[PDB]
């Protein structure tokens, strides 16, 4: 099996191709920036009602309705304007680890240790919410899921694989293989034709939803990648790992650009999310706090304190008006 | 907007009934299609034990979901691939995991050249051997218990307690001791 010699000689050619394509780091050409200073964001709303730790949340396209997944076995839909609960969906499996809100606002998905992405109909003619389809076929825990339309959805699983599902038939039309570690998070591009994936191997891969091939592979992290999120332009993405740092990768450059870290921060990142402009990089940490990173200068522009337990998820609205921050204290906080 | 508060009142009324059954239920993780659930109830106290099914051997991610359970039932097989020492390192990683320092572990147990400290090891007289048991069997059995207890008493930081045992009543009495210590620490008594 000494073709490993070819594999090590080929990855050196890729590494030397990245060194030649790098004139100056993004942080180097940044002195033309008016510093944003201290970003003091305050808790404008606190949605209570969840019984156990909150693992994931997802905003709707209307930026008013949001779904939250807590490990107590309940999927609550919140109206962030009036704190009113629109729906309270009981789940068959209480160990939910992710939740998704469809762009049309008619369906919501969730998954976890049951390896099943349950689809729920929110616009039944009877008026109640029940299960639409149970997407089974994954051999590992569901870590993330994102809707492409009312009938298509990609899921990430702990079996080092990602799959594209057909909600009408309940079949996997495309399975994405190539990862070696437990996949933790996914994120679609604004054109929803590509999506990056973060696994437990300090590597991120670029996928094509149609052809089902791994376009690019990005390394540079030292521990398991915990969260991932695309840039608003779809040409870059950020990663959160257990090595207590965030790194921003680049698609057409195929090289790590920025490293968001500090000596006083020795805890990993649990969630990442860009704002509407992409100027700020919000990241949830394991020290029960959230740190707003300047995506261009790599300097922390603000801290989001107030959560009494580990922050799990982070979501920025489509219009960039609010930020919902879920944590293990069974509380959701809205910031501005 | 007025009809919206009517639905919010209907939902919060259901959430209050769902809190009564969740806070009065002991959740347990069994270690040793994705997850098998088992609802058993002892002395009219509801227990919800979860057995991990179709999941890979990499546990450093999905084990954090069980950080708020009452106790993790860690079953060890007292054994050649040296399976017992592999469980010692797994119990070591679970005991010193950042999110399981407050999660107690109910240790359920069930050699000669794989542990050199077994030669000069003496049976503690505080042990209670069962009647009709060979003394060297007692020494080898309690030696494995001391290997797990040595890891459990090497880190005083954390609310986790290790309960070694050599079946449902043992879990019931242990969970009662865990919630009792949880109540004493809320009042800064223990």
């Amino acid at each position, epitope marked *: 099996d000494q073709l490993r010699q070819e594999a090590e000689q080929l990855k050196n050619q890729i590494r030397d191709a990245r060194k030649a394509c790098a004139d100056a780091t993004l942080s180097q050409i940044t002195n033309n920036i008016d510093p944003v200073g201290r970003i003091q964001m305050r808790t404008r709303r606190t949605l209570r009602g969840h019984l156990a730790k909150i693992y994931a949340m997802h905003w709707g396209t209307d930026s008013r309705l949001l779904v939250s997944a807590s490990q107590d076995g309940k999927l609550i839909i919140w109206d962030s304007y009036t704190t009113n609960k629109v729906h309270a969906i009981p789940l068959r499996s209480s160990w939910v680890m992710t939740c998704a809100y469809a762009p049309s606002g008619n369906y919501v998905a969730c998954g976890g240790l049951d390896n099943i992405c349950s689809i729920y109909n929110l616009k039944t003619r009877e008026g109640n919410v029940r299960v639409s389809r149970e997407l089974a076929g994954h051999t590992g825990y569901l870590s993330c899921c994102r809707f492409l339309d009312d009938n298509q959805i990609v899921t990430s699983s702990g079996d*080092t694989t990602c799959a594209l599902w057909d909600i009408e038939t309940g079949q996997q039309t495309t399975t994405f293989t190539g990862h070696t570690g437990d996949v933790m998070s996914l994120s679609l591009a604004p054109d929803t034709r590509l999506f990056v994936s973060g696994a437990c191997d*300090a590597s991120a891969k670029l996928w094509d939803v149609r052809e089902g091939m791994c376009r690019q592979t990005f390394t540079g992290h030292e*521990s398991d990648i915990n969260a991932i999120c695309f840039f608003p332009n779809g040409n870059a993405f950020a990663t959160g790992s257990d090595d207590a740092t965030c790194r921003l990768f680049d698609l057409r450059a195929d090289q790590e650009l920025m490293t968001y870290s500090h000596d006083n921060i020795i805890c990993g990142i649990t969630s990442v999310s860009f704002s509407k402009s992409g100027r700020l990089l919000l990241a949830g940490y394991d020290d029960f706090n959230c740190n707003v990173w300047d995506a261009l200068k790599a300097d922390r522009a603000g801290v989001l304190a107030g959560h009494d337990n580990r922050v799990s998820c982070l979501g920025v609205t489509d219009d960039g008006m609010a930020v919902a921050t879920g944590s293990w204290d069974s509380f959701l906080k809205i910031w501005n | 907007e007025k009809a919206q508060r009517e639905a919010n009142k209907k939902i919060e009324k259901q959430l209050q009934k769902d809190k009564q059954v969740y806070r009065a239920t002991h959740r347990l993780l069994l270690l040793g299609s994705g997850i098998f659930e088992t609802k058993f109830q002892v002395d009219k106290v509801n227990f919800h034990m979860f057995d991990v099914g179709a999941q890979r051997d*990499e546990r450093r991610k999905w084990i954090q979901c069980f950080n708020d359970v009452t106790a993790i039932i860690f079953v060890v097989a007292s054994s050649q691939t040296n399976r017992l020492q592999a469980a010692l390192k797994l119990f*070591d990683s679970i005991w010193n995991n950042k999110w399981l320092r407050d999660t107690s572990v109910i240790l359920f147990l069930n050699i000669e050249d*794989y542990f050199p400290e077994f030669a000069r090891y003496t049976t503690p007289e505080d042990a209670t051997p069962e009647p009709g048991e060979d003394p060297r069997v007692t020494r080898a059995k309690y030696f494995i218990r001391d290997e797990f207890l040595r890891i459990s008493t090497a880190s005083g930081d954390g609310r986790h307690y290790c309960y070694p045992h050599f079946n449902i009543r043992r879990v019931f009495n242990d969970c009662r001791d865990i919630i009792q210590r949880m109540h004493l620490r809320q009042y800064e008594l223990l």
Partner: nanobody, 126 residues
Framework: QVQLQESGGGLVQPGGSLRLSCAAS????????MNWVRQAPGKGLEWVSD????????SYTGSVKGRFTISRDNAKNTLYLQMNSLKPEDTAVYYC?????????????????????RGQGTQVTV
């Protein structure tokens, strides 16, 4: 990129000596805990020895306690395993392992299959 390329190995008569070396790169060697994992032919992976980030806390398996010793040069980003008085039971592929959590007392998912952050392995035949 976590490479963790190992050195050493070879055929040594029973009762000889050998010294294994890990060539770590892509991460900070001083912040992560190191481990030694070997795979006997026809058997599963097993933990050999680990050493703390500082170098004080040291543990071995019972089959190697007293004969093998663990060492790490934090200034050189390398890990040493001086093997003394080897046995024919030590014939296995020795992998240099590293659990991903830094600054942590727990060292998870070592000695596991399909597990990254571990080297290709060196063959020590006795």
């Amino acid at each position: 990129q976590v490479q963790l390329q190992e050195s050493g190995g070879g055929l040594v008569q029973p009762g000889g000596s050998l010294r294994l070396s890990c060539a770590a790169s892509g991460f900070t060697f001083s912040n992560y805990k190191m481990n030694w994992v070997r795979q006997a032919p026809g058997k599963g992976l097993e933990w050999v020895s680990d050493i703390s980030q500082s170098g004080a806390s040291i543990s071995y398996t019972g089959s190697v306690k007293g004969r093998f010793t663990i060492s790490r040069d934090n200034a050189k980003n390398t890990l040493y395993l001086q093997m003394n008085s080897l046995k024919p039971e030590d014939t296995a592929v020795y992998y240099c392992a590293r659990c991903p959590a830094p600054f942590t007392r727990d060292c998870f998912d070592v000695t596991s299959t399909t597990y990254a952050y571990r080297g290709q392995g060196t063959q020590v035949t006795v």
